Amino acid sequence: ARVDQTPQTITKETGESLTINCVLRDSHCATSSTYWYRKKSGSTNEESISKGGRYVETVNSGSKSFSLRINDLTVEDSGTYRCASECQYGLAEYDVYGGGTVVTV
Amino acid sequence: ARVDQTPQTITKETGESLTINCVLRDSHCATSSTYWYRKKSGSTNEESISKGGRYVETVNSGSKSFSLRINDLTVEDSGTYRCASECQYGLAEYDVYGGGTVVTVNAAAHHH
Amino acid sequence: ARVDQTPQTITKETGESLTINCVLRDSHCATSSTYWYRKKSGSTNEESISKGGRYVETVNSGSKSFSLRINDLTVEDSGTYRCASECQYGLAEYDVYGGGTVVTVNAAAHHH
Amino acid sequence: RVDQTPQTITKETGESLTINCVLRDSHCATSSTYWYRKKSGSTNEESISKGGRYVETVNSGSKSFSLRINDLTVEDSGTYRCASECQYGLAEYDVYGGGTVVTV
Amino acid sequence: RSSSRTPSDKPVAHVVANPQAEGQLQWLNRRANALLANGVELRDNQLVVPSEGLYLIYSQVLFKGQGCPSTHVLLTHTISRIAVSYQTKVNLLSAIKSPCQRETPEGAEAKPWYEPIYLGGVFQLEKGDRLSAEINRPDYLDFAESGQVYFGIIAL
Amino acid sequence: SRTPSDKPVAHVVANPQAEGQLQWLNRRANALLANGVELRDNQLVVPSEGLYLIYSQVLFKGQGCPSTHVLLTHTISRIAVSYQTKVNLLSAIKSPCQRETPEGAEAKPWYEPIYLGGVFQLEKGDRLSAEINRPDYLDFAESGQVYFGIIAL
Amino acid sequence: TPSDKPVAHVVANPQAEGQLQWLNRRANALLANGVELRDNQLVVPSEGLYLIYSQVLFKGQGCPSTHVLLTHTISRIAVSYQTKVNLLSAIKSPCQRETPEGAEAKPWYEPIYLGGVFQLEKGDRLSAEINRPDYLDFAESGQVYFGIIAL
Amino acid sequence: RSSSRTPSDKPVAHVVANPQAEGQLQWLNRRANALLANGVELRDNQLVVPSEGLYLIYSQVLFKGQGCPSTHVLLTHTISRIAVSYQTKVNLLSAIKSPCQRETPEGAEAKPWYEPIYLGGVFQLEKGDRLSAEINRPDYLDFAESGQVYFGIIAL
């Protein structure tokens, strides 16, 4: 079905950069107006991601996929990776989602 | 019988601690990759229990048995708890399940 | 009734002529598009009768009615006969059907 | 497979039909062309000859090849199912299609 | 002997179930009070959109049985779309109905039950999109009379 | 572990706790899906060109025989990159119920199984699918009554 | 990038009037690497262990009379023992009783499948046959088939 | 006056029921077109896997009765596996069939019924695994003619 996020469930080591990729399967969404949502494990409020250096958008326009990077994984690193995109055709405007959980021991 | 939950029907009081034991019967399943799932009474969606705080886990690979002690028990945490394990030998990878239900009664509040 | 064949139960002699008439009641159907279908005892194939020779079809647009005289009455042609026509008004085009059975037995042949 | 173009034809005596079939399997080639006429209403089947006046406009780009039929009276009316032999590896087969012409 | 007056219209389709067909959902258009014109094609129980634009999709199914066995029966009815842009079948309109919660009748002279389902909505469709109406249990279809099962789109 | 690996293989079994649908599972005791065969959308993906053996069994059970006259079918299909159309490779049909629902001495559970098997030449990326028309008579209450698998010979 | 070993999968011709005739020049069917189809028979080209399988689907448009018994057998006549012997066999009664008495016909379907591993030698003749070729349902997709593969 | 000419290697077995077994399912290999070689054992009507690897399991059983005594008849046929890792009998392949749908000579005579059942699948087996083909009613077996009942494995 639509939107297949590659790292769905990840278990990484303290200090290890985990890369999160989302691959679009609906050929109507654009990888240019990409959005990222994190919900840190244990909270029930969805926060946004400010991509400022540590989170790099290694978007691949060929595969209609976008990527995100973390660095020096911490020990409090707990959060569910959710990606979104602002698809747009003629009239209709919608968004699409994926799925992803992170665990750091 | 490919994973055996010992406490099938339990009745504890709010503020207690129940231990559920699971013993492996397939020598291909490992005591390292164990998982627990609960289904809250009256709901259909099965939720996945997280490892931290109230849920302490004792694992012994020698006897291939793992347990899940549940502390600070409330009356809203009554449901069917299952244990799980990841098995892998040759080209095969599968999982195994169990079953066991908990019922919690309350303790009222002495109103003078 | 969207076309009605008049003869329902017919009893003919060894080798004679059965006449089946169908009258168009829908002014959307044209007498310029006629089709015929017959059935055989226990058989499951809808066959198309051809217009020529032993199968005679007469069309008169005034009453919007057509007939089918069949001669040389073999007794293996015992079955339910339906008629059809092509109707088309505006953006719609459809066809209509009927129903009616024929039965014929044999004779003594005078082989003394 | 096979996409024979003359689906329903009821032309009048004296016409000319070009019969093209389009291949959908990348195993079938426009190399093995052939048609199986029916000669009015028969209870068997016949064939049809090629190599000269009954030649085709075979075009591999559209994966269609033709059948030039002239002076149609009543012997040039029948079911011209189309056929081709497809081959990829250890498999060898042929495929059929469909298309009829009628001249009054 | 017939005639036709001014059509002047746009893509339309209204197909009806085959009455003399066994347990299957086969759509027909060459039957009284049915339409399939102006480019809409019925390929394989599917409607082919001939041009990009907004369409209205509708369908009705009537389920009838002459008794309720005990097996928890759920009657479903869905209109789906497979698009050229996203080639996965997704539901646009759906409905579910439980025909009988009543304990398996130990004796009622069969108790014939009737349950209908209707679906309708407006959607944006693209060129070459294939719409499909389906049901889960074709053994309870009541295609006896007409207008009891149908399926259609209309270019608004 | 003491043994080596081999050639593309798959043996998937129906989900017992999915009453109402035919979901193929591979992460269950005595099931296989390895060496390149992918399970995408209830479909097996051929990992390499070659000769494969495909098989599937389904067991149908119903309570009493109603007067609906149902036809039970079971088919294995292949949609190839070479021919992008659903074609059936193996098929079988069975009519289980002739007589009407008993009006005296009722509840008559009938059981009818169906088995399919054959060898075919498949290409890379071909998606194989085993399906049935009436998934309401499935008897997955016991182990290995419904299954589906391929193995490259 | 080729493939090898004797293989065969033949399917009945739908245009075969009341008879079980095996065909090979159709889409999903193979017969290569030495296997010959002679007189409705498969000829093993090399000695080894082969996998033999076949299915036939029986259809009738009503219960005719008494009890008809449907059989389907794969037989082998070898160069070492020149008699046709049955390797795999199955019997099935398609109609139980209640031949249609006035009430309309009720088409019944009964399939039968056979499969096993056997040792075949050079020149052996395998044949799949059924007793009532008048109830054959060879309509479209492979409902009846017969094949071998060198393991 | 004997010899051999071909080697062959794959552990294989194809055993057939004993015709002189009046009321039981005893598997035999010393019959014309039957095989059991390259290490496979048959311990107490059970096949013993000689090496770990991928095997193909198949079996057919044919049931015959000369009349239906009571509607309540269930024909079952299952292939079991006991592994060294999990010492309990588990079903690998199973099938059930009901030969008699009510009736029970209410207006008929001794109506001989025949019902075959076939089982097949691929499994990964380890050294020492004991496979067993069993049936619930050993009195309805029809092994009177030929290859109608059998059971076999082959290492692919």
From TrEMBL, chain D:
Pfam families from the entry? V-set
Question: Residue ranges of the Ig-like domain?
Answer: 1-81
What is a single molecular function from GO for this protein? Answer: peptide antigen binding
Q: Which CDD domains match?
A: IgV (cd00099)
Q: Name one GO biological process term.
A: adaptive immune response
Please give the GO cellular component terms listed in this UniProt entry.
T cell receptor complex
Record flagged with keyword Signal: yes
The alphabetical list of record keywords is:
Adaptive immunity, Immunity, Immunoglobulin domain, Receptor, Signal, T cell receptor
Q: Which PANTHER family match?
A: T CELL RECEPTOR ALPHA VARIABLE 1-2, T CELL RECEPTOR ALPHA VARIABLE 21
Q: What is this protein called?
A: Antigen receptor
The taxonomy runs: Eukaryota, Metazoa, Chordata, Craniata, Vertebrata
